[PDB]
Design a protein around this ligand. Structure first.
Ligand SMILES: [Ca+2]
Ligand SMILES: [Ca+2]
Length: 530
């Protein structure tokens, strides 16, 4: 016990850095107010031009200023180590680039809180997104998951931080953190929890040097099921239970836990599954899931926090009278990269989709997709009376389950966010493994093609109804769509444009519909809000 953080405390930050031999120094000053979770800092590069983007360094450049609510004061390791302070060490893995390693001492000198850091970066690409300065200068946010490290009298933390790339895509930085106290005195060791962190980056008009003004909020939180509605907990469970049978099995848990962060091995996954399946029946029931949400703090905040759910109900029917393949149950694993063509002036979306068939253990018109195949996409839509059109082109590569599209709004400004149309705007380009080729309805209906219909239910907002014909005209695969949307809120997340420009991974669970000579599927899409 000793909260030197009752009122407003002055901060000093000093960083000495070396990334791929490019050395630099940063100095910062400002103030922290713990009782709100508020930091205000200005940082100067004192060595001229900073050889990495400012937002890569935000996390390195004072978690002692977090606001711990009254029910969590006994979980604040950071303040408990003051005034002698703590060592903070990290490794930060930039996906498809290099890594930073950092060591800092955070402590009081007089009445000023000081963060002193050495940072070493290696194996960066000289023209990747970091050394090539291809990151936007925006705002970053995330949740820092804290667990006790009893053996060092400290804490560990892990989190994935996303920063926007200039092309509209998203750069992942995987953080592994360790804190240990400098002095010998007692410290608070916490239950599992997280810091909700928002960072706002701006410039000072009156500063010539390379620099960053930072406004940051940090709030401690701990997920408790008692703080969520039956509806919210049901939804969360259904993300996991994507085959709809009412229980979570090991294959399901595998895929869906890996959406909470990139940091889990097959063994971590076996361990959490084993610990959550309290009666050892090989499935996680609803009650077991409730306790697993408190035990594994990332589950709810990462799957459902700041997320607009979109419930998809889908049906596919052949256009021709020819024989088709009606599959056994299975799913399509989807990953999606959204970006922007820097030379297109119209409102548009570049969409890259990776699609592979899974979920059956090894335990005719396919020939048309051997084959890089050109695509045409045409959508005409009406949402709450707002008319629009999209027209696009690209290519599908079935054997790598890859497709690329550029999609243009030809009616000016698109009155809904582009991500709400991703599922509407080519399942025939899935890669079906060799043991599942007899389960690929989509290719089997080509060249005459299939009708794809859906209803999409945006939680606490309106719905889209869609009908598309997917077929070959010549050597071009064509998706033609009508969409009708009703009962949207004019300032909800769709018509108010409050959805981020990125996309999560999802599994589409497919079952046969023998009575229609087709298939159906239902899946939940998770759209990030802001
Ligand atoms: Ca299930
Ligand atoms: Ca069980």
């Amino acid at each position: 016990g000793e909260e030197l953080f009752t009122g407003v405390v002055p901060i000093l930050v000093e960083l000495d850095g070396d990334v791929n031999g490019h050395k630099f120094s940063v100095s910062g000053e400002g103030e922290g107010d713990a009782t709100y979770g508020k930091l205000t800092l200005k940082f100067i590069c004192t060595t001229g031009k900073l050889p990495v983007p400012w937002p890569t360094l935000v996390t390195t450049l004072v978690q002692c200023f977090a606001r711990y609510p009254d029910h969590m004061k006994q979980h604040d390791f950071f303040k408990s180590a003051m005034p002698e302070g703590y060592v903070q060490e990290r490794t930060i893995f930039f996906k498809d680039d290099g890594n930073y390693k950092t060591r800092a001492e955070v402590k009081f000198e007089g009445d000023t809180l000081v963060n002193r850091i050495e940072l070493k970066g290696i194996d960066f690409k000289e023209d990747g997104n970091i050394l090539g300065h291809k990151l936007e200068y925006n705002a970053i946010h995330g949740n820092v998951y804290i667990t006790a490290d009893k053996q060092k009298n400290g804490i560990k933390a892990n989190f994935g931080l996303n920063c926007n790339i200039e092309d509209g895509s998203v750069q992942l930085a995987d953080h592994y953190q360790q804190n240990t106290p400098i002095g010998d005195g007692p410290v608070l060791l916490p239950d599992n929890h997280y810091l909700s962190t928002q960072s706002k980056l701006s410039k000072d008009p009156n500063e010539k040097r390379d620099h960053m003004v930072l406004l940051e909020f940090v709030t401690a939180a701990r997920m408790q099921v008692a703080d969520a509605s039956e509806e919210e907990l049901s939804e969360c469970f259904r993300i996991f239970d994507f085959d709809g049978n009412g229980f979570i099995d090991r294959e399901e848990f595998g895929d869906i836990i890996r959406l909470t962060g990139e940091q889990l091995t097959d063994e971590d996954v076996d361990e959490i599954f084993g610990d959550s399946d309290t009666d050892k029946n090989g499935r996680i029931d609803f009650d077991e899931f409730l306790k697993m949400v408190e035990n594994v703090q990332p589950i709810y905040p990462e799957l459902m926090g700041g997320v607009q759910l979109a419930d998809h109900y889908q049906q596919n029917t052949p256009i021709g009278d020819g024989p088709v393949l009606l599959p056994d149950n299975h799913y399509l694993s989807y990953q999606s990269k959204l970006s922007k063509d820097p030379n297109e002036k119209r409102d548009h979306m570049v969409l890259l989709e990776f699609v592979t068939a899974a979920g059956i253990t090894l335990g005719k018109g396919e020939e048309l997709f051997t084959g890089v195949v050109p695509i045409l996409v045409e959508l005409d839509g009406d949402v709450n009376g707002h008319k629009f059109s999209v027209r696009g082109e690209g290519e599908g590569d079935a054997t790598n389950g890859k497709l690329t599209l550029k999609l243009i709004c030809t009616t000016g400004k698109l009155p809904v966010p582009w991500p709400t149309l991703v599922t509407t705007l080519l399942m025939c380009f899935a890669r079906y493994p060799d043991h599942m080729k007899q389960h690929d309805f989509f290719k089997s209906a080509m060249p005459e093609g299939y009708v794809q219909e859906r209803t999409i239910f945006f939680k606490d907002d309106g719905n889209y109804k869609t009908r598309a014909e997917v077929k070959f005209e010549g050597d071009t695969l064509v998706n033609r769509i009508e969409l009708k949307g009703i009962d949207f809120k004019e300032d909800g997340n769709i018509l108010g444009h409050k959805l981020e420009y990125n996309y999560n991974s999802h599994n589409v669970y497919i079952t046969a519909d023998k009575q229609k000579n087709g298939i159906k599927a239902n899946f939940k899409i998770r759209h990030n809000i802001e």
